[PDB]
């Protein structure tokens, strides 16, 4: 294995542990969470840092937005030795209970979107790594943040979940939409998915948390609506549970 | 809420906790397991069995061969109190290590079916209950038996499975077999899709475990492959995972 | 899985244990039923969900055995009673009318099936038509004018999810199966059952001759419209319209 | 209704009973089996004749290869008045017993191909109306014609069936084929299926014979592939369908 | 390379050029356009005349109605000789702007139809041929014609465009229509899906171009909605378009 | 009213009324050298934007990130602040096998294989680039003297599904589609088109793309020579005066 094409990371340039945000800019924030962590690389829309946790080496990587620019990190990150992956990210609350400032904790996830089926037959089940998943679920009791175990929405339009009336396929977003809503689908976001069904190929462990912005679900019911921006509280949980995973590693 | 036309039973005949064989047959050998257990009805391919554990009452209803009659069991039993379910069977190994007598917990399931269809678009997830899952998983552990968490295929055609060679949809069949071997799956059995989707949808927690009869994986490649039909390893997972359920409720 | 050859890992049946004419019901209970209008019947089988007794119809041998509810469990019937040497058979069940002239008490002959499920996707690409044999068919026909019972020949709709046939609104995907539900009735279907399309695909791969005749219980679109809906749930005169079409299939044979 | 745009008939023009074959010159030859048959319209790909049979009124319409030529000649002979179709054309055998010269009679037919899915989700089945499907097999065996009544296969791609293997989609044409070879299907044409599901949709009874012009299938085991052209028979088959079919509303 | 089996054609009989109207009685009209056309064929709904433009040897062949037709026309005029295709039809508006006597120009269309799916993946887009595209752009502006150059919409059921709330499948016809609509669809008619993609598998090159019939959103709207039958000015700017093809091809 | 666009970061007056779209964000320094007094306009996430001027028409250039996910959104967000023209100039894989390193190829259509222009139309409808750009870009490299191709390229979803199908699951399905593209005169493989084509036909803007060709892998498999090109100045000079005689025409 060699220098990758689209992260520019050579083996030895990352842990077995990676965090990954969507956000490029974000990863500065997260790398801030590590003991010594370095910029390693700033290739098109990944930008990586890489330092310690518990004295073992960790690093963050930003994906972009969408499944394929996510993939494709992960496919190089784990090239590069990494085998344990924790998606950092925002998402918009449906399920009525989930509230700005709330956190998510992906279960699985809604394959509606194109890179998933590009690695498995539709039928097959977006679903996150159970140590991942628990790890992130005691990390929020332990620090005390409210969270919401479940599934989430992936899509590849954006546009399309909040303005889904003026797209030329508005009957099959609207339709499916209600369809989320009476599976007791969390909430949305784009990455999910695709990781969570290219991990399951790759072989390693995939698990995601998000900070939830709002809902537009109470939005339109004229419930309070709290919005948030800060990552911060999603960002604790992943590292607490980084902690986890390492130790019992 | 009345008789119900399938199960033929009414609120009242069963408790919130139902095991869901598959063999009308199996019922009242998972019934032993229970505290004076009697049986509720007989109908159709549906025996139901009701007792007590720990104080809680209890139930055990068979749900035949399939999605479409194990989706009308939860759908009857939903309507009359139920709410935690989970399905013990039998499966056949795909992932090698996954040998005649293990305990395969499913974390998700493979739509390869079509009861689930009518309940849910097919790019949502068959995921099990998380809290189901890891009293699974803690149980197998605590009683010793060896255990392999993960996804396991669900289709409607049993014959498919097994002479998918002379289908006149071989190709398609075979293909995605190979597809389901590259993605990790542990095995191949029948209702587990149908009953986590009609779950989610039902606002209830189901999970799922099973007993590996055989491997046609390690058969075809002329290794051991020990066959096993004694479900009582399994039974004694499920039921300790009921109990922890019922402690923690 | 058996252990033994010849003998079906579901079914428990071996060769010899069933005649070449099989009757398919959903219910296990109504095997009993169904066996009394052959001469000396006895159980031969009871596993799972099938049980299966064999007797003779004009000293032919023949048998009647359940199938369970939905296309998985029927097409596993088909698979191991052809193993063991079937190769004409006759579903008997229950259905929801849908054209309105189908009301409470009628018989209806499935000529064909919508496949609105799983199984028949597991044996052939879904533009494969789910046809009965015509040879059933007619016998069925024939059975019903000559016993003077009101039937209804034509498709049927078949489905995995019964709960979404009567509670489609509640679903997750109300509206493909409240849109296809709109289709079904502006193509003539008769009523809808849940085996058929299963049974019809299946036999067309195995080379089998299959066909389905059905009690009418009731019509939900004739109550949606307040016309009147007698219910039925007795069996017994489908039940004899496919005793009867056994009979000529028997003598047409030899 | 009044004049229908792509046949130019209008009510009266055309009988309760037609026949239709795929090539408009196919019209002249079944019309003289009927009695008195005159032209009565030669619009596009749709030629159309009217007589008698039996004293009862009864047309012969071309429908052009295709689903989307013939659903647009059921549809149109609909508002006129018609109600009883028989479709009449040629077929390449697929089952291997099924020979040049022989006819088959089409109890339902495979939808690969686009027309019936505009009309019906394609889970619904292109199945044959049971009393022209029973009045064709009651009319071969009394004519002495060797048939077989099973399932066809319809496709849009005529070089679809032909040269599967140099189509970018050969993967699925040929993995399809052989689908329909294990589920017994008798021979390969193009127009049932729009025309059955389209008459379940419109409340017509629809059937359909074919002579079998080859058997690919048979040619490439190298066995005898006789090859057939004339439809006579065919026809003969059909016309004795109509007319018992006629003799039974009366 | 022989005779073909449906066009009844054989190397020889047709130039490179072809102009494929659906209604063979339109080929003696458009080969009126040509010099020295002769009549080479009438086969099935086949009409087939050859004649020069500039001295070159051009050919016009129906289609009939629907894809399936139409390619078997493509598959046999290529093994023929040709290599270039202009489709010459009629079309009902979709986008407001279409109005009755305009022209439209297929820049791609839609493939709501079987026979595409039968030589090419869903996935893969149905477009006309760059050269031909800008040639039949060129010579409308050149004729004075109001013209349209945009995605038109195939579809295998004419009678699913007309009567869509009749159908079973009512709910999936009217979803995409609208979905049609707001995507800027200009017009709505059924071979340029098939001939595009065949085209693009065969290697020659295809383009299409009609007379709006009349446009029924505009209808719907209460707004004025001529409506026109002469295809008159479609084939002036295809054989202008050919014209142009062939001095360049030199 | 429009104001900051969440994503991109920009509001109406920032950018002009074209826009030319790299994918990668560092491309965008290097085709910003190409207008008169380019300035840095945003930075938000993989989205960098620079506007300048061309002929003293407002230009800009902004990058859309690997996907259509998050080329859609930058295509959606530039349309509400005034955005009219877009050119995506990015690399591609070829396929047929007169495409090679170093040549230029332009989109005339799209094969759908992703699924965000799924999210905005049906399948059934085609990827197809706008007639003005495409035209304006052929025009453009012949007056440049670059080798071009023009015709359909394949988008998808999976980059590694591209180079390395035999090993996923689906390896059946992409191996299948993959020799259907080469039968069907597919010029070369890239990512972003289809989601910008069928957006553009729906949000009723011009849009047509350009590539440099940086190997082609079919050419590789028969031991051709298959030399391997990185530096995109020629499908951005390209892209330049596309754009100079599309803004030329509208005046
Ligand atoms: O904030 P990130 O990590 O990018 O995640 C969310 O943000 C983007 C949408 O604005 C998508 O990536 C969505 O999943
Ligand atoms: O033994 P059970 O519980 O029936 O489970 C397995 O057994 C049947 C297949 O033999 C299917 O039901 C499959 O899921
Ligand atoms: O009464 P049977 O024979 O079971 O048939 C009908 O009854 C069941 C539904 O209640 C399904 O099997 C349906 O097809
Ligand atoms: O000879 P006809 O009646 O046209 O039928 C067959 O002939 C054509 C194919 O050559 C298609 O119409 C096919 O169905
Ligand atoms: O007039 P033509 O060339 O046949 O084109 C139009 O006419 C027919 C519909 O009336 C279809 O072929 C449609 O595409
Ligand atoms: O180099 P760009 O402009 O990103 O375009 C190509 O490069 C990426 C793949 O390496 C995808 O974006 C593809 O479309
Ligand atoms: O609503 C939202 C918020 C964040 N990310 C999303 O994808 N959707
Ligand atoms: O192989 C097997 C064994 C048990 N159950 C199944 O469904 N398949
Ligand atoms: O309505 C009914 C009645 C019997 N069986 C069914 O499947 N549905
Ligand atoms: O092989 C054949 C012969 C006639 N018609 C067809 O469609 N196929
Ligand atoms: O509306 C119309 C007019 C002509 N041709 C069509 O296909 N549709
Ligand atoms: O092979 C390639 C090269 C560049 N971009 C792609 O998408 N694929």
Same mark, same amino acid.
């Given at each position: 294995?060699?220098?990758?094409?689209?992260?520019?990371?050579?083996?030895?340039?990352?842990?077995?542990?990676?965090?990954?945000?969507?956000?490029?800019?974000?990863?500065?924030?997260?790398?801030?969470?590590?003991?010594?962590? /370095?910029?390693?690389?700033?290739?098109?829309?990944? /930008?990586?840092?890489?330092?310690?946790?518990?004295?073992?080496? /960790?690093?963050?990587?930003?994906?972009?937005?969408?499944?394929?620019?996510?993939?494709?990190?992960?496919?190089?990150? #784990?090239?590069?030795?990494?085998?344990?992956?924790?998606? /950092?990210?925002?998402?918009?609350?449906?399920?009525?209970? +989930?509230?700005?400032?709330?956190?998510?904790?992906?279960?699985?996830?809604?394959?509606?979107?194109?890179?998933? #089926?590009?690695?498995? $037959?539709?039928?097959? $089940? =977006?679903? =996150?790594?159970?140590?991942?998943?628990?790890?992130? +679920?005691?990390?929020?009791?332990?620090?005390?943040?409210?969270?919401?175990?479940?599934?989430?929405?992936?899509?590849?339009?954006?546009?399309?979940?909040?303005? $889904?009336?003026?797209? $030329?396929?508005?009957?099959?977003?609207?339709?499916?939409?209600?369809?989320?809503?009476?599976?007791?689908?969390?909430?949305?976001?784009?990455?999910?998915? =695709?990781?969570?069904?290219?991990?399951?190929?790759?072989?390693?462990?995939?698990?995601?948390?998000?900070?939830?912005?709002?809902?537009?679900?109470?939005?339109?019911?004229?419930?309070?609506?709290?919005? =948030?921006?800060?990552?911060?509280?999603?960002?604790?949980?992943?590292?607490?549970?980084?902690?986890?995973?390492?130790?019992?590693?």
């Amino acid at each position: 294995v060699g220098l990758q094409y689209h992260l520019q990371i050579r083996p030895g340039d990352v842990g077995r542990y990676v965090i990954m945000p969507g956000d490029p800019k974000r990863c500065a924030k997260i790398a801030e969470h590590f003991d010594n962590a /370095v910029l390693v690389a700033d290739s098109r829309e990944y /930008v990586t840092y890489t330092g310690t946790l518990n004295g073992e080496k /960790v690093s963050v990587t930003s994906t972009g937005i969408g499944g394929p620019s996510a993939s494709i990190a992960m496919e190089e990150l #784990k090239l590069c030795g990494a085998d344990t992956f924790i998606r /950092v990210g925002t998402c918009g609350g449906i399920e009525l209970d +989930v509230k700005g400032g709330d956190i998510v904790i992906a279960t699985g996830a809604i394959r509606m979107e194109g890179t998933s #089926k590009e690695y498995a $037959p539709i039928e097959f $089940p =977006a679903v =996150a790594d159970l140590e991942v998943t628990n790890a992130l +679920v005691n990390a929020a009791k332990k620090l005390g943040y409210t969270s919401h175990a479940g599934v989430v929405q992936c899509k590849d339009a954006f546009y399309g979940q909040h303005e $889904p009336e003026r797209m $030329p396929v508005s009957y099959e977003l609207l339709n499916k939409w209600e369809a989320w809503k009476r599976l007791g689908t969390k909430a949305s976001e784009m990455e999910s998915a =695709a990781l969570f069904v290219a991990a399951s190929h790759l072989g390693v462990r995939c698990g995601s948390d998000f900070l939830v912005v709002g809902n537009q679900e109470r939005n339109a019911l004229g419930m309070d609506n709290p919005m =948030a921006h800060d990552t911060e509280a999603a960002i604790q949980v992943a590292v607490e549970a980084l902690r986890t995973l390492i130790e019992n590693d």
